[PDB]
Design a binder for this molecule. Sequence first.
Ligand SMILES: NC(=O)c1ccc[n+]([C@@H]2O[C@H](COP(=O)([O-])OP(=O)(O)OC[C@H]3O[C@@H](n4cnc5c(N)ncnc54)[C@H](O)[C@@H]3O)[C@@H](O)[C@H]2O)c1
Ligand SMILES: NC(=O)c1ccc[n+]([C@@H]2O[C@H](COP(=O)([O-])OP(=O)(O)OC[C@H]3O[C@@H](n4cnc5c(N)ncnc54)[C@H](O)[C@@H]3O)[C@@H](O)[C@H]2O)c1
Ligand SMILES: COC(=O)[C@@H]1c2cc3c(c(O)c2[C@@H](O)C[C@@]1(C)O)C(=O)c1c(O)ccc(O)c1C3=O
Ligand SMILES: COC(=O)[C@@H]1c2cc3c(c(O)c2[C@@H](O)C[C@@]1(C)O)C(=O)c1c(O)ccc(O)c1C3=O
Ligand SMILES: [Mg+2]
Lengths: 289, 289
Amino acid sequence: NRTILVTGATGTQGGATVRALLARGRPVRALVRDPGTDAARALAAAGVSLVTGDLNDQASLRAAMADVHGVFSVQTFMTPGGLGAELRQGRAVADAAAATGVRHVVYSSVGGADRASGVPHFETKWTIERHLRSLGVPTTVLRPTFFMDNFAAWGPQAVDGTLVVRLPLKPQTRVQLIAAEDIGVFAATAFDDPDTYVGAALELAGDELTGPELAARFGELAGMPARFEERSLDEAAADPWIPYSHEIAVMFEWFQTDGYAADIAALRARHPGLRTFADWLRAIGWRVP
Amino acid sequence: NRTILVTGATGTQGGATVRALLARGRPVRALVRDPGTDAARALAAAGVSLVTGDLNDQASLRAAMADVHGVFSVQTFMTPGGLGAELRQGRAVADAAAATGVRHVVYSSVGGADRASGVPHFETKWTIERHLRSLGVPTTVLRPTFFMDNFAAWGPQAVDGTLVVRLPLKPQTRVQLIAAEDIGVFAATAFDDPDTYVGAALELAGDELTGPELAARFGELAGMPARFEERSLDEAAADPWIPYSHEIAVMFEWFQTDGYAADIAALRARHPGLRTFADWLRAIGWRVP
Ligand SMILES: NC(=O)c1ccc[n+]([C@@H]2O[C@H](COP(=O)([O-])OP(=O)(O)OC[C@H]3O[C@@H](n4cnc5c(N)ncnc54)[C@H](O)[C@@H]3O)[C@@H](O)[C@H]2O)c1
Ligand SMILES: NC(=O)c1ccc[n+]([C@@H]2O[C@H](COP(=O)([O-])OP(=O)(O)OC[C@H]3O[C@@H](n4cnc5c(N)ncnc54)[C@H](O)[C@@H]3O)[C@@H](O)[C@H]2O)c1
Ligand SMILES: COC(=O)[C@@H]1c2cc3c(c(O)c2[C@@H](O)C[C@@]1(C)O)C(=O)c1c(O)ccc(O)c1C3=O
Ligand SMILES: COC(=O)[C@@H]1c2cc3c(c(O)c2[C@@H](O)C[C@@]1(C)O)C(=O)c1c(O)ccc(O)c1C3=O
Ligand SMILES: [Mg+2]
């Protein structure tokens, strides 16, 4: 059986992984909590098999993994269960894979998880990585950087005729970015080349830009003036419109002090289709609100 | 000036620290968000000076540290801002101490913070410890174990004439415990013996017991039958009546796999009054609910 079980299939990383897997010729089974949603029906229409389960329900995970070759493992921490739930879920996926004879887990972590960042939602992922390693289940770890896709909901607004990117970054802070579509590409590639990818951990980025450079990219596409403005970390941390704003502010402070460290040139050699930020803007057809 | 600023002064660790400092003749200043509460007024009535401030407000922290010799630093994670807020607050205390020339910080962390536990509210504390050391703020780290005081609100209930301690521990799991009163003793001791304590980290426990033994201690005092019963980790994690239940379940799993490592005999040699669990039960006058 060549089937891959994709967790988080209706989400950003999982959805990208579904598309890459289908294109590469793998059967895809999607873990969904509710098979009756628009998103789940859309997956089925694309040729995905649905299985009902929940990352909090270990028995349901074992059932979801019946006869599959591989599992794509991704979790979110932005739920009522928070970071503790993310951690337990990641370890549950690993345990269920071990118990059901899964041959290959591709786990999505985060760039810098291995670098003692102290970012709470990076440390959860590191702890999950360590658990997978301890079980001996053949594993590839992907460590994605800043999702370009974040800018769909959190892109710049027009202020007095100028697009403003306002984020808790110094103007000089360089940030590595990855298109979610490329996370999917690497996940699919890993399953089809285990000789290269089993036992590997790979930090993923397709571009590296400062805030002013990000603003320039939007301005060039929009035909509008654009600028970057630094937001204070304390202000970002307190924002009632940003879920888990304190953890996110810790993360942005780490971008400022440390940051991601993917080798973009080496990734492009492996994957010539690796997307730049300009590519992301073109692919989504970004427009000013 | 020999004044100590106590953060969390109306709480468990801070309150214990205030009492121990007063016993040693230190002037004490208490950080309170609202000086009009009953708890704050009681501190003032004891001869503790109040200063209004908030761990989320860096300017208020600098003001609170004006002219003080030392700071007792403690944070909670079970608030709206969660783990991220705990981390930012701990680093803010450190930064304010650095900015105001504080001569000694006693920071309360947690046993095993230094042992890569993966427990999210342990990793926050490890990150705060690291930040203090990076700044060169003269620092003593206390690493308390399981608070005996937890059993005041989370004690055993009588079921069919038997007291039942029900926790996510294997019957064989040994847990180290500390009376909060003793955390205060060590904090005050550290300020008065900086030669010994500046630069030090000390894991704190006054007893070490299994679940069955904890049950036996309650039974002995109450003069009735008692037993321990293991609760599953999944059930504990999902408990709607336990705040941050998922993080707490990760912690209990770590008790099972790893656990605390204080040298109790060595601590009792330093502090002969170090409380056993039986001592704590007697001191608070524990009674069957
Ligand atoms: N946004 C970024 O820039 C970025 C960069 C690196 C890493 N990450 C990490 O990505 C992860 C989130 O991935 P995403 O953006 O694809 O998430 P998402 O929110 O787009 O998707 C979450 C998916 O998980 C599913 N899900 C949620 N709870 C579930 C449960 N209990 N059982 C089964 N399924 C459940 C959702 O229905 C959805 O399919 C986070 O851990 C985050 O830290 C994000
Ligand atoms: N309970 C245990 O067994 C145990 C064992 C080891 C460590 N710990 C750690 O102890 C810490 C909590 O200490 P505690 O039990 O003394 O807490 P607590 O809840 O008893 O007291 C918290 C204190 O902090 C104050 N406070 C809260 N938010 C504040 C803010 N924004 N600004 C200023 N003051 C604020 C409260 O008013 C109170 O004075 C946690 O980090 C926990 O992980 C607990
Ligand atoms: C354009 O900026 C954003 O979209 C921001 C942004 C950026 C990241 C994450 C966010 O959740 C948000 C949102 O909080 C809105 C905002 C403004 O703060 C995130 O969770 C994350 C993550 O879990 C793991 C690695 C990451 O690199 C990230 C991020 O980079
Ligand atoms: C008797 O057991 C308890 O009181 C439990 C308990 C125990 C601990 C903590 C709790 O919050 C609770 C509550 O969740 C109720 C319950 C039942 O789960 C906690 O926050 C903590 C902590 O931050 C740091 C170190 C610790 O060692 C601990 C604990 O040991
Ligand atoms: Mg299929």
